[PDB]
Every structure is written in structure tokens, then in C-alpha cells.
Nucleic acid binder design. Structure first.
Ligand SMILES: [Mg+2]
Ligand SMILES: [Mg+2]
Ligand SMILES: [Mg+2]
Ligand SMILES: [Mg+2]
Ligand SMILES: [Mg+2]
Length: 94
RNA sequence: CCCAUGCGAGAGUAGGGAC
RNA sequence: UGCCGAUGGUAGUGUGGGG
């Protein structure tokens, strides 16, 4: 099972997102179901290595944010236009 | 082009549909 | 441009600064 550690974002928007990426992290979003969407931030390198395995995109993953696990599937990924980096990820609740 | 701050598409995604 | 349509990200951008 893939276990991803994340934190809830304290700020959003272009400025905040660029700050994260300049600091070796990147934004992501968890949506789906009855609960409201949850905007989170991830460690770039750790997730990048994880998603290098094809199962990352087929399996139900576990994101540890706050203190509980959420159970999601990768729904979409935005990659840098010309750099080997992850820009954003959509996670859908499972 | 970048930073701070405010504003924020187009496309696509979740979801919905008496079609 | 052919049904409606979030959230987040992206483009662009007002103000101030940097270059
Ligand atoms: Mg700005
Ligand atoms: Mg739109
Ligand atoms: Mg749209
Ligand atoms: Mg449907
Ligand atoms: Mg938006």
C-alpha cells in the first residue's frame, strides 16, 4: 500500500502554490463524496519516487493528513512543461 | 521574467441531468 | 459548440518592488 504524508494548506492561489514548489513541495487536492474538498501540500521528491511505479495510478492509496487516513486514487496529474517535476495532483476519494 | 499582495480564465476533473 | 458543472492547479492580470 502507498502511504503519502500530507498537511492541509494554510493558503491557496498562484502565489502560495509557487512558494510551495520553490520549497521542494507541491499542491494537491482531494475531492469526491460528501465531504468538502481538502487542499493539501506534498513532499515533491517522495511522491515523485512513489509515482514512478505504475501501481501508483491504479491502486487505492492512503494519504495521512491531520491524524487520519483518507483512501484515494490518483485522478489527474499536472507535470512541469519542461522539467522532470510534479506540478499538481488530483486525488479522488475511494 | 521574478517577488509581495489582491483578482483570476480557457481547457479538463469530481459531481448532476426531467436528454 | 453544441446538457449543467464544482474544488484545486495553470494562463493572464491591478497595485508596489526587483531586473
Ligand atoms: Mg503574483
Ligand atoms: Mg472553467
Ligand atoms: Mg470547465
Ligand atoms: Mg453521470
Ligand atoms: Mg477556479
Amino acid at each position: 500500500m502507498f502511504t503519502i504524508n500530507a498537511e492541509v494548506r494554510k493558503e491557496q492561489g498562484k502565489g502560495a502554490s509557487r512558494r510551495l514548489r520553490a520549497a521542494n513541495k507541491f499542491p494537491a487536492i482531494i475531492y469526491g463524496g460528501k465531504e468538502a474538498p481538502l487542499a493539501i501540500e506534498l513532499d515533491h521528491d517522495k511522491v515523485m519516487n512513489m509515482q514512478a511505479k505504475a501501481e501508483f495510478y491504479s491502486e487505492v492509496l492512503t494519504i495521512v493528513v491531520d491524524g487520519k487516513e483518507i483512501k484515494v486514487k490518483a485522478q489527474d496529474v499536472q507535470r512541469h512543461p519542461y522539467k522532470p517535476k510534479l506540478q499538481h495532483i488530483d486525488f479522488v476519494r475511494a
